[PDB]
Structure 1
Amino acid sequence: APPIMGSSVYITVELAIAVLAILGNVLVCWAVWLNSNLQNVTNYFVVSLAAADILVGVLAIPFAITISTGFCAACHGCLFIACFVLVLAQSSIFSLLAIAIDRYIAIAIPLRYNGLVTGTRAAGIIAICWVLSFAIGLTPMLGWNNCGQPKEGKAHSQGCGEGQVACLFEDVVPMNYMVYFNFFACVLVPLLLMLGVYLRIFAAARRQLADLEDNWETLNDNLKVIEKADNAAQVKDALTKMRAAALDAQKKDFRHGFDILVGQIDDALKLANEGKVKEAQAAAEQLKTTRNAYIQKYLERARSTLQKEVHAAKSAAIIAGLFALCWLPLHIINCFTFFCPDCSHAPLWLMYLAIVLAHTNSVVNPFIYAYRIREFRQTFRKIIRS
């Protein structure tokens, strides 16, 4: 069977993916430039991520096509075109890990969030990750490669000149690097961390969501036992437990509503200490209007804000998920090639299928923002319409 015919499909799909990679991610970068609301610390890691996806369609995919030919080239030159995609992958992981941490700081200590993360501190972080990504990605070029024991039969078959080799991935890149160093240390380890990071995010949101409900119940259940109370001692316990939850739930309309709430508990409390039973019961009745004029609104404003931060977390969680699903197949085939020599090698069409599946990750990113993030959605429309 002709080799080029099967190759014709692969090249066509690769070019198609490149087109969607460049266009889709350019729209993200253009969106952040225009809109001011999209200019924040979280989106800066998004643009860094989009930068990696753009560079896939421009270089990594052209590089992926050129490798498949098995053309003649210097072994060191062959290493760059084979390993450059590893730089772009390592950059994305650091970007995904940063977003997870940025979302964790935003939900854990929202007070300290303004002081811990800033605009400039993020730029320095991104630079370090890009520098580290080049080091990690292009590690084989420092000496950990198969240039020392080349395939001379393939070199003479291909008609390669002296010093040149038939440039193929599995020929120049050792599998111990791809499995132990790249897959396990650099990919799998940070991915497991993102799992644990997002787990602590949802768990933290779960606690705050019975906190705001425990205090609400603490307020109501202590109110109705003042009405049917027996003595001054009963009114004390119910009000002192309410006063505890009053300050607890607090952690200018905000501070003003509570000054009236706690102020009314203080007044009703002092009537209990004086022994005024019926006047203490009646004073605590004024809390009901107070409750449903300020508090109940802060119950559905604070609760509303929690759903925003959780929806933002899930939206980010999907990206890291889709990244894992796209890349993992290719890593497993590397694990089979490495760990099982008794097994047959994976067919060439399956190799092609895994590569394009890894490349597709570059396309899926902008579709998630538009479908999930409302600000990105409305931003895209006015750009397309103009």
Structure 2
Amino acid sequence: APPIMGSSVYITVELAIAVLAILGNVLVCWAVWLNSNLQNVTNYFVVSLAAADILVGVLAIPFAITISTGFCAACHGCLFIACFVLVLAQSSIFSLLAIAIDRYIAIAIPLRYNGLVTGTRAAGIIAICWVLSFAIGLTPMLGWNNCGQPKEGKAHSQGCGEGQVACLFEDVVPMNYMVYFNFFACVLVPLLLMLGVYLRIFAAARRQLADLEDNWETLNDNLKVIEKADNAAQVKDALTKMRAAALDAQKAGFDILVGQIDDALKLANEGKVKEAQAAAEQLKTTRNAYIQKYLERARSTLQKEVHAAKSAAIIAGLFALCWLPLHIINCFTFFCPDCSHAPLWLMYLAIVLAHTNSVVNPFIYAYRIREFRQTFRKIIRS
């Protein structure tokens, strides 16, 4: 069956993917430019990630279409077109890892976040990461390639010239580089690291949203204890505890609260039980009017952070889902030489799926993040 029909389907699909990758990601980048509420450090990594996807459509996809033809080319030029996508995938990994870390900093140490994670430090990190991405992805160009052992029988059959090879990914890029260096070290390890960062993010969230609840219960149970108490010393016990739990909430209305606990304690230390109890009853007014509003705000903010962290995790998860099959196929090719090579149709499918990852991010932002969604609408409307 003529190779141009099988190759026609693959190519059309690649072109559809490129179109969509470019479109969606230009809109991400355009949204961040226009909306100042989307101008934060997290979103600069998002933009870097969008840039990489734009380049998959503009460059990586045309390169892959090109190399699918097996056209004659100087080996090192062939190399470049085979490996450029690795640079883009690496850049993406760095961006995803940074987003995970950024979100972890925001939830673990919100006090120090703004001064630690600035836009200036973020742009420097992005630049460094792009340089590193070029180094990792283009490592084969530094000598780890099969250009030294060309398939001359395959090159002579297609009438290639001197110094040229039939340009095919697996003929030029060593599988050991693909499996051990690229997959294990540069993809798998950073993905496992991301998994770990997200676990810590979700656990820290759980611990804080438990802690908020505990402190509130403490305030309410110590009120009851004070309400039915025998003497002044019991009242003093329950307000000494209450005081400490109000000062931790203030670090993590409060002027009034501590003050009122203090009023009650002085009375309690003078042996006046009924007066201490009545003064402690006034604490209820403060709890309703201020403290409960703080508990519910703080809770809301933590829920917003968990949601935003889930959205970022989904993105990282989708990268793994889209890229893993191609990596897994490479493992079979490398580790199992007695196994028949995965068919060309499957290679095409795995490649296309990897490329499809460059289309997905804009949809996740639209479905999961209000500010992006609202800005996408205005850009589209106008």
Bucket of the pairwise TM-score, normalised by the shorter protein: over 0.9
Aligned residue number for residue 92 of structure 2: 92
How far apart are the structure 1 equivalents of 2:156 and 2:212?
74
How far apart are the structure 2 equivalents of 1:58 and 1:258?
57
How far apart are the structure 2 equivalents of 1:367 and 1:80?
31
Aligned-pair distance for 1:115?
Answer: 1.1
How far apart are the structure 1 equivalents of 2:206 and 2:328?
35
Aligned residue number for residue 303 of structure 1: 299
**Structure 1 residue matching 2:38: 3-state secondary structure:** coil
Report % sequence identity.
100
Aligned-pair distance for 1:244?
Answer: 1.0
The CA deviation string for residues 102-131 of structure 1, in whole angstroms up to 9 with x for no partner, is 000000000100111111111110000000
How far apart are the structure 2 equivalents of 1:249 and 1:155?
73
Aligned-pair distance for 1:88?
Answer: 0.3
The CA deviation string for residues 204-226 of structure 1, in whole angstroms up to 9 with x for no partner, is 00000011011111001010111
Aligned residue number for residue 183 of structure 1: 183
**Structure 2 residue matching 1:160: 3-state secondary structure:** coil
**Structure 2 residue matching 1:165: 3-state secondary structure:** strand
The CA deviation string for residues 63-93 of structure 1, in whole angstroms up to 9 with x for no partner, is 0000010000000110000000000000000
The CA deviation string for residues 19-66 of structure 1, in whole angstroms up to 9 with x for no partner, is 000000000111011111111111000000000000001010000000
Runs of 4+ aligned structure 1 residues displaced above 3 Å come to none
**Structure 2 residue matching 1:301: 3-state secondary structure:** helix
How far apart are the structure 1 equivalents of 2:334 and 2:92?
25
**Structure 1 residue matching 2:68: 3-state secondary structure:** helix
How far apart are the structure 2 equivalents of 1:376 and 1:183?
32
How far apart are the structure 1 equivalents of 2:5 and 2:297?
61
Aligned-pair distance for 1:312?
Answer: 0.8
Aligned-pair distance for 1:3?
Answer: 1.2
The CA deviation string for residues 338-362 of structure 1, in whole angstroms up to 9 with x for no partner, is 0000001101000000000000000
The CA deviation string for residues 240-284 of structure 1, in whole angstroms up to 9 with x for no partner, is 1111101011129xxxx1111111100100111100011111111
Aligned residue number for residue 367 of structure 2: 371
How far apart are the structure 1 equivalents of 2:19 and 2:321?
21
Normalising by structure 1, report the TM-score.
Answer: 0.98
**Structure 1 residue matching 2:282: 3-state secondary structure:** helix
How far apart are the structure 2 equivalents of 1:307 and 1:227?
34
**Structure 1 residue matching 2:230: 3-state secondary structure:** coil
How far apart are the structure 2 equivalents of 1:281 and 1:135?
71
Unaligned runs of 5+ in 1: none
RMSD, aligned CA: 1.0
Aligned-pair distance for 1:235?
Answer: 0.4
Normalising by structure 2, report the TM-score.
Answer: 0.99
**Structure 2 residue matching 1:69: 3-state secondary structure:** coil
How far apart are the structure 1 equivalents of 2:154 and 2:9?
25
**Structure 2 residue matching 1:73: 3-state secondary structure:** strand
Q: Please tell me whether residue 131 in structure 1 is matched to residue 131 in structure 2.
A: yes
**Structure 1 residue matching 2:161: 3-state secondary structure:** coil
Aligned-pair distance for 1:308?
Answer: 0.9
**Structure 1 residue matching 2:144: 3-state secondary structure:** coil
How far apart are the structure 2 equivalents of 1:26 and 1:351?
28
Aligned-pair distance for 1:307?
Answer: 0.8
The CA deviation string for residues 139-171 of structure 1, in whole angstroms up to 9 with x for no partner, is 001111001111010011000011111000000
How far apart are the structure 2 equivalents of 1:152 and 1:286?
92
The CA deviation string for residues 148-195 of structure 1, in whole angstroms up to 9 with x for no partner, is 111010011000011111000000010000000000000000000000
Aligned-pair distance for 1:295?
Answer: 0.4
Aligned residue number for residue 260 of structure 1: 256
Out of 357, 362, 371, the position equivalent to 1:361 is 357
